[PDB]
C-alpha cells in the first residue's frame, strides 16, 4: 500500500494492519470494543519502510498474512500510527480449482 509522508516527511514511524474473517459488508473499525483484552480484530504492527532517496522512493510498505483459512473472506485495512487509514477491503483466500473439485468427486 501507499507510503505515508506527513508535511515534514521526517521521522516516519509505523503502520497497523487489521484483518478479520468477515462475511459480507457489515464490518467497521470501532467494532465490538477492542478495549483492553478480548479483541474483535487481528492486528499487525508494521515497521516504517526505508525511503532509498527521492527518485523512486515507493518501497511500498506491505505484509504477508499467513495462518488464514482457505476460501475465506477477510476484512482488511491499514492505518498510520497516531494521518491516513486505507479503506476496508474484503479479500477472499483461494479455494479448490474446478478441476480439483471434480477429481475428489469423480474418484471415491
Amino acid at each position: 500500500w501507499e507510503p505515508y509522508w506527513p508535511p515534514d516527511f521526517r521521522d516516519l514511524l509505523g503502520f497497523m494492519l487489521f484483518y478479520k474473517e468477515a462475511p459480507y459488508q457489515n464490518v467497521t473499525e470501532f467494532d465490538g470494543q477492542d478495549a483492553c483484552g478480548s479483541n474483535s480484530w487481528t492486528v499487525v504492527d508494521i515497521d516504517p519502510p526505508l525511503r532509498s532517496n527521492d527518485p523512486k522512493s515507493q518501497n511500498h510498505p506491505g505484509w504477508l498474512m499467513r495462518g488464514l483459512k482457505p476460501w475465506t473472506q477477510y476484512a482488511i485495512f491499514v492505518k498510520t500510527l497516531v494521518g491516513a487509514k486505507s479503506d476496508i477491503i474484503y479479500v477472499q483466500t483461494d479455494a479448490t480449482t474446478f478441476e480439483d473439485y471434480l477429481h475428489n468427486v469423480v474418484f471415491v
Partner: peptide, 21 residues
C-alpha cells in the same frame, strides 16, 4: 480426498490403487 492424498501431498503407489473403479 484423492487431491489431498496425492497432489497437495504424495501417495503410495498402493494408496493410489485401492479404489480403482
Amino acid at each position: 480426498g484423492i487431491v489431498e492424498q496425492c497432489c497437495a501431498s504424495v501417495c503410495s503407489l498402493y494408496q493410489l490403487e485401492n479404489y480403482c473403479n
